[PDB]
From Swiss-Prot:
Residues 7-279 form the Peptidase S8 domain. The gene is PROK. This is Proteinase K. Its EC number is 3.4.21.64. Keywords: Calcium, Disulfide bond, Hydrolase, Metal-binding, Protease, Serine protease, Signal, Zymogen.
Length: 279
C-alpha cells in the first residue's frame, strides 16, 4: 500500500533515500497490535484516530489531553494520515499534566500500570509502549522502564533534547529499552537531539506534522516526535511477525539504513529506522 504526499518522516522510514514523498507500507498496518502512549493523554475523539484510541488511565483530575503533546505522539504512532501503523489500537496513559510536566513517582506508576493492564487487553500481535518524556538520571525511573520491557512490552523512549550525552538522562539511559534519537529531513542529526553510546536508533524528529487537540493538526519538533515513529514501526513489524517485543529494538537496528546520517558524533550509532518494505 502507498500513501502519496505523506509527511516527510513517514516517507523517510520506507525509503532508502531522503526527499521522497510516498509512504509505502504493508496493508496489515499494525492491525492486532497495541501501543500505549504514556504522555499528556490523547484526544481519543479526533477523527484521525477513527475510533482506535482510548484513554485507559489518568493520574490527574481529567483523563484528557489539555496540552496536545500526547495527541501528537499518538498520531505519529497510528493516526490515519500521520501515523506509521495505521490500524493499530492506541491506549492513552496520562502521566503528564496539561503543562507537559510530571513527577517521577507518577511516571513510574504509569509504567507499572501498563505492564499489568496489558494482561486484560486483546493484543494478539504484541504490545508497545511509547515514552516521549524524560528528565535527569534516576535509577528508579530506569528500573521502571526495565520492568516494563521485561513484562513483554516493547519499550521505546526519547533520547532527550539537550544536544548532550544521553547517559545523563532517564529513562533514556536504561540499556534494556530502545532509546531513540532525532533526525531532520536532510538526513542530519536534529540540532537538539541527544547522542551517545546509549542511543539505539534514530528516527524523524524535526518538523513533524501530526494530530493536535481541538481536532487540529500541527508540526513540532523533538526526540518526542522521533520516538513514536519507532514505536509505530515496532508495532507494524510485530504484526507482520518479523520480530517480537523482546527483540524489536535489535531487529530495527539490524535492518536500519546505515551510515546515511550527518553530524553523528563518534561513538553514536549511525542508524535510521527503515521498514524495508518491498512490493
Ligand atoms: Na537500549
Amino acid at each position: 500500500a502507498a500513501q502519496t504526499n505523506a509527511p516527510w518522516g513517514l516517507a523517510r522510514i520506507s525509503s532508502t533515500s531522503p526527499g521522497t514523498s510516498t509512504y509505502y507500507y504493508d496493508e496489515s498496518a499494525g492491525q492486532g497490535s497495541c501501543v500505549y502512549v504514556i504522555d499528556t493523554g490523547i484526544e481519543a475523539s479526533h477523527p484521525e484516530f477513527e475510533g482506535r484510541a482510548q484513554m485507559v488511565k489518568t493520574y490527574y483530575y481529567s483523563s484528557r489531553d489539555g496540552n496536545g503533546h500526547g495527541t501528537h505522539c499518538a498520531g505519529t504512532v497510528g493516526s490515519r494520515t500521520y501515523g506509521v501503523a495505521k490500524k493499530t489500537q492506541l491506549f492513552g496513559v496520562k502521566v503528564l499534566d496539561d503543562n507537559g510536566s510530571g513527577q517521577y513517582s507518577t511516571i513510574i506508576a504509569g509504567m507499572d500500570f501498563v505492564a499489568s493492564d496489558k494482561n486484560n487487553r486483546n493484543c494478539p500481535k504484541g504490545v508497545v509502549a511509547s515514552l516521549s518524556l524524560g528528565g535527569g538520571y534516576s535509577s528508579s525511573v530506569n528500573s521502571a522502564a526495565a520492568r516494563l520491557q521485561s513484562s513483554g512490552v516493547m519499550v521505546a523512549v526519547a533520547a532527550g533534547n539537550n544536544n548532550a550525552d544521553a547517559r545523563n538522562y532517564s529513562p533514556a539511559s536504561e540499556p534494556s529499552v530502545c532509546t531513540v534519537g532525532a533526525s531532520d529531513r536532510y538526513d542530519r542529526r536534529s540540532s537538539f537531539s541527544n547522542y551517545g553510546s546509549v542511543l539505539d536508533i534514530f528516527g524523524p524528529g524535526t518538523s513533524i506534522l501530526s494530530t493536535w487537540i481541538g481536532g487540529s493538526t500541527r508540526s513540532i519538533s523533538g526526540t518526542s516526535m522521533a520516538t513514536p515513529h519507532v514505536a509505530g514501526l515496532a508495532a507494524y513489524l510485530m504484526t507482520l511477525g518479523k520480530t517480537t517485543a523482546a527483540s524489536a529494538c535489535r531487529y530495527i537496528a539490524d535492518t536500519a539504513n546505515k551510515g546515511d546520517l550527518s553530524n553523528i558524533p563518534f561513538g553514536t550509532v549511525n542508524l535510521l529506522a527503515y521498514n524495508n518494505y518491498q512490493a
